[PDB]
Curated annotation (Swiss-Prot), chain C:
Highly expressed in brain and peripheral blood cells, such as neutrophils. Also detected in bone marrow, spleen, heart, liver and lung. Isoform 2 is found in neutrophil granulocytes. Homotetramer. Isoform 1 can interact with isoform 3. This interaction decreases Ca(2+) influx through isoform 1 and suppresses susceptibility to oxidative stress-induced cell death. Contains two binding sites for ADP-ribose, one in the N-terminal part of the channel and the other in the C-terminal nudix hydrolase domain. Both sites seem to have a role in channel opening, but the interaction of ADP-ribose with the N-terminal site is absolutely required for channel activation. Belongs to the transient receptor (TC 1.A.4) family. LTrpC subfamily. TRPM2 sub-subfamily. It is found in: Cell membrane; Perikaryon; Cell projection; Cytoplasmic vesicle. The lineage of its organism: Eukaryota, Metazoa, Chordata, Craniata, Vertebrata. Signal peptide: none annotated. This is Transient receptor potential cation channel subfamily M member 2.
Amino acid sequence: IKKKECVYFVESSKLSDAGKVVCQCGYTHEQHLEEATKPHTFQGTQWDPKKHVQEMPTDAFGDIVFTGLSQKVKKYVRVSQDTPSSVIYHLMTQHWGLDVPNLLISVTGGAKNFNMKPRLKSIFRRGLVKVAQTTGAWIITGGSHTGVMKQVGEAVRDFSLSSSYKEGELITIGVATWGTVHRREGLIHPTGSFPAEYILDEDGQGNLTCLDSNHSHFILVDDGTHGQYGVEIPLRTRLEKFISEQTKERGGVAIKIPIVCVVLEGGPGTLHTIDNATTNGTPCVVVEGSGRVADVIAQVANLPVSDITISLIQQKLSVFFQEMFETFTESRIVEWTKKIQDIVRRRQLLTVFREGKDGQQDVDVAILQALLKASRSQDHFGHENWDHQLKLAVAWNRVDIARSEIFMDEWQWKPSDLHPTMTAALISNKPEFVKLFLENGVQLKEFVTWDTLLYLYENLDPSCL
Amino acid sequence: ISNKVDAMVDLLDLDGDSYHVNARHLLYPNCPVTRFPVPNEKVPWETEFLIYDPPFYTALEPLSTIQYNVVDGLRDRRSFHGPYTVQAGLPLNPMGRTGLRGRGSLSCFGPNHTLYPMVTRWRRNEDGAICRKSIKKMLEVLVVKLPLSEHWALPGGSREPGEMLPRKLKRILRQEHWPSFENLLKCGMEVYKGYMDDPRNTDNAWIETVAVSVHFQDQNDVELNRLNSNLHACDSGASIRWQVVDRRIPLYANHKTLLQKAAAEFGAHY
Amino acid sequence: ISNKVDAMVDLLDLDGDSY
């Protein structure tokens, strides 16, 4: 029982407020606000969110099963906001039964306001099921039955009741805020939960969002507040780095796990979603024509960083943002402009999904479009980084792209370096990539050494008799 | 004909700013604080911003008797690009606004001086003759990696008064060897006497560098035969390593700015 | 038709001193 490591981050919130929310009083919570130490002695005169958020070990670490909507087993943990991403990587790897990923599609967007267009609703799942079909992709999304997070869980069901492998192997990680869960009661049992119950009622939520019903594992973060969304934003941005940058160790030194961030529509918490990701170094792709914050950064993503001003954001927040515009004050449009400028001058970590007569395909070519402009700046200080570039570039057989991106560079023609890529193009079919290597003139006669045939011969097709 | 007429179906369907970009960032290094966002438009100190309410983190107001714009005691409080202004008893950061006030994790308010030095050799290949890079010629620098870091920082920093050697190429590096390169630093060209784009800057304090560079023309000279094999290079640190100066060095971006103007004095490839 | 459509593949590719 690895409970002596993870913690509550529960809060000894001395009652020093009255906001009259949902026919209640006091600070966030109620008679359950005094856990064991109570609002007592003298701790608290102005409620500083740093002085005393004392860390006790968790009480929500088990296995949640829904009523009848999905007869399965789903494991959840109530982690804190300060747990390092090594008490948990040591916990998904071997305390849960999860493998080591090779692709980390991040699907974020809007919430509680989402009308997915009937045709865009189609490009989305043809674009998101195929990445799950291949490789060992992990789908990390917010845990809620609303938004792009309810559409990413609405296609996994289609790919679990009718698919190539049938059953299901997708690992759809759901990370959200504990405090923003409707019926947290019954999900809190000392020791474990071991098939506890979660009734999905979406009428009495009011402002307290329910969990989804088609994810795989739920990682609930906690800060000790009720109704404060946005707490689950910084922690996953080190989760998606420590998982994706310092977890694999062939090559003797280090190799980067591919990571992509897909955003459709959005809102206040969707810009802090992509700014933190791009700052960390997560390539992202925006789906233009969707709606909110995706679009406002879809048609400003090529203009100079100096052009972007408060006037431009004011004019471009009065078309995509209609009813929330009057909510936007003068201290939320000069704080929405600096973040947009910040994500713009990272022009090597941002692309756009063109809609009509451009990028006429699923979301997938767009995710490696983001990776291509991202890793073009990252093509020599990673050395081997070319090899994984092609190990994904086999997913679309981007023969024309691979010809265009490398063969018309100032390419050093690198016969030795073409061989790891040759082997990567051999482990499965890749009919045209190997011929690409033969007009380049990969001399097979020295390419195949004894260890080369070794490597080729451990990688038979597993399905052959 | 199907393939070409498929090429004719689509055939008739044819009819920035240069300001400090490191100080104005969120999450001031090693401190759970935020800065009030300052977009590129209002960075100068003359643009009228009245919602201005930046934090005051410093790892108040009787700070008089500070000789700004002059050599205040043994600190030399006057920046290279002319005197600055004082908004009571705290200096104002030139080159624009940052978003924070106070001093942060810095010694004192005003121009903090460091002396980041440059030591270079054309990389040897197998014969001594410099092997041609992609187009022009290629050089190397000596970078140092202390354990608690993620980049190959340059060997220099805060100049202790009367040291003339920047306190880090003076310690955890070559020691009991000073007199020689301390007699060589008064020989070379300056490449940048000015302001850095550190992420640690604030509206009331800033850091400045003098940047000296020394090059070694030969490979078996009397300089490279007494520099490399005379260095301790490990007191409490964890690394020392000559690195190839390319466009994507795992170095601190602020220092990579210095190299981008220093390696260019000979015709190199950064 | 191959020969003529081969003539249409290229058809839309059109847009001193006295001493």
